[PDB]
């Protein structure tokens, strides 16, 4: 299963944090610090997969953002690597030329996108168009 999903910027501001198992405040803060310290220094030469305690984190860069999923050691690395892209592509079609600030000002919306595609640590929806069907239709309604 997914342990958590982070979206961090270069600086260390954590623009999205979804936790899929209850850590302490202090525990979380440290996970945030750790994920950052590892990921930021690693060039495109380095792999997208990094073991980390006896979890492992998948990450991918897009602009100044880092999209990090934390999974069990037995979970499929590449599957999750492309699920990241699946998600980011949804965000781009939903925000039309998506950027970092789009997620700041519409944070409450980002969470809505995340939760359609991932729930309780596992993947929910792979179908990009179907997510957008549930986003646009049924954004409208008050």
């Amino acid at each position: 299963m997914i342990r958590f999903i982070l979206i961090q910027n270069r600086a260390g501001k954590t623009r999205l944090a979804k936790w899929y198992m209850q850590f302490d405040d202090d525990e979380k803060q440290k996970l945030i610090e750790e994920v950052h310290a590892v990921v930021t220094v690693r060039d495109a030469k380095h792999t997208n997969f990094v073991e980390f305690r006896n979890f492992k984190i998948i990450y991918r860069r897009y602009a100044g953002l880092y999209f990090c999923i934390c999974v069990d050691v037995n979970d499929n690395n590449l599957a999750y690597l492309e699920a990241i892209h699946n998600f980011v592509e949804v965000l781009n079609e939903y925000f039309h030329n998506v950027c970092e600030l789009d997620l700041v000002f519409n944070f409450y919306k980002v969470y809505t996108v995340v939760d359609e595609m991932f729930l309780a640590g596992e993947i929910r929806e792979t179908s990009q168009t179907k997510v957008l069907k549930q986003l646009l239709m049924l954004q409208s309604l008050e």
Binding site: A63, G64, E89, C99
Partner: peptide, 9 residues
Amino acid sequence: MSQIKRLLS
């Protein structure tokens, strides 16, 4: 520096 830079292409 460009929080502003677009996420894909």
